[PDB]
Amino acid sequence: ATKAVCVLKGDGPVQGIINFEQKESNGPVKVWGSIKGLTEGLHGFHVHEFGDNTAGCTSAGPHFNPLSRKHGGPKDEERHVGDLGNVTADKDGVADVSIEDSVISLSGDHCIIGRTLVVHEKADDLGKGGNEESTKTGNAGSRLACGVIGIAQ
Amino acid sequence: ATKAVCVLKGDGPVQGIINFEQKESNGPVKVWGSIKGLTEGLHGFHVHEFGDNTAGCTSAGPHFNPLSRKHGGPKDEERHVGDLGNVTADKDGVADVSIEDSVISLSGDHCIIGRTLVVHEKADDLGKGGNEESTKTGNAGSRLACGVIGIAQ
Ligand SMILES: *Sc1ccccc1C(=O)Nc1ccccc1
Ligand SMILES: *Sc1ccccc1C(=O)Nc1ccccc1
Ligand SMILES: [Zn+2]
Ligand SMILES: [Zn+2]
Ligand SMILES: [Zn+2]
Ligand SMILES: [Zn+2]
Numbered sequence A, B: 001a002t003k004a005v006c007v008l009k010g011d012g013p014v015q016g017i018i019n020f021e022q023k024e025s026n027g028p029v030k031v032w033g034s035i036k037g038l039t040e041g042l043h044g045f046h047v048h049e050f051g052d053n054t055a056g057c058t059s060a061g062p063h064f065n066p067l068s069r070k071h072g073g074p075k076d077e078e079r080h081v082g083d084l085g086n087v088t089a090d091k092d093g094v095a096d097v098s099i100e101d102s103v104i105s106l107s108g109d110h111c112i113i114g115r116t117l118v119v120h121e122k123a124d125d126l127g128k129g130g131n132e133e134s135t136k137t138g139n140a141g142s143r144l145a146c147g148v149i150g151i152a153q
Helices: none
Strands: A002-008 A015-022 A029-036 A040-049 A054-057 A082-087 A096-100 A118-119 A143-146 A150-152 B001-012 B014-024 B027-035 B039-047 B053-058 B085-087 B097-102 B116-120 B142-147
Touching: A002 A118, A015 A096, A029 A082, A040 A096, A054 A143, A082 A096, A143 B142, B001 B116, B014 B097, B014 B116, B014 B142, B027 B085, B053 B142, B085 B097
Parallel strands: none
Antiparallel strands: A002 A015, A002 A143, A002 A150, A015 A029, A029 A096, A040 A082, A040 A118, A118 A143, B001 B014, B001 B142, B014 B027, B027 B097, B039 B085, B039 B116, B116 B142
8 A cells, every 4th residue: 555644734724634545556545634724614625736835835836637637526527636626624623534536646647746735715616616717726715725745654 | 857846844944945856767866955044064964765744854754765775975885765965054054955866866766756855953974973873874863854855847
């Protein structure tokens, strides 16, 4: 199995820890952890292309999209590799993350190691927002916290 | 060419930006950037195995050593892949980093993307300290700052 991890930090209250595990080469990736300091509701959750946090989350670039598709939700055929949908924060501002995804990987060209995980201010509309931006970014607003996805033991 | 980047953060503030560039997979990696907030002199400079900064630099694990060798300096045949020697801070506490290394890579099993770059409190003795620890860690003392090495544009 391969494992990865990411510490989410930003300029404000949002912080988190996210773990990734992939038992088989080309098998699904389990994503789990916790994010706090969020407003209650849905928050866009994306792998962005660059693991460049030199200017914070703004240096991370666009959604990780090695297969040149439009933006969608994780259960859509038409999605970016980095489109992990939304995490859900409760009224305490805590998101307990538990995702299984078949498109991201921890090896090869769908590999997300060395890229940036970002949690957003607003909900990702999953390409169903009714404007042009919806099928590019999902209209998820500001980047509240991010980190580089690293190899874990 | 492949490019990578790392933001080093640690108390001081010890803060740095380190860039990596490799023109072909068979080529050396150019490592350049700046680290500030250091004491004047030599500071050990290592790629540690895990890109895990969940508990700060301590979670990064040992020196990246995929070939099961002893610790050395960068110009030694007997070294860890992660053994980048020392950076040098001036009397303003600034290390201007300029290294070319032939052993680290931005691809393959010597790949350092997704691992942790660490700058240390003391000088790396490069395996020439005269105790057992010298040929494992180089006696470079505490981890001052670190970050996960990410893919850059
Ligand atoms: S997982 C990963 C993360 C960042 C850069 C490269 C990789 C990677 O595993 N790439 C591979 C491509 C082709 C064959 C093996 C590995
Ligand atoms: S470059 C990289 C970054 C993060 C995880 C894995 C890799 C990688 O490509 N590793 C390889 C090991 C052995 C053979 C090919 C690739
Ligand atoms: Zn995003
Ligand atoms: Zn997207
Ligand atoms: Zn070290
Ligand atoms: Zn070493």
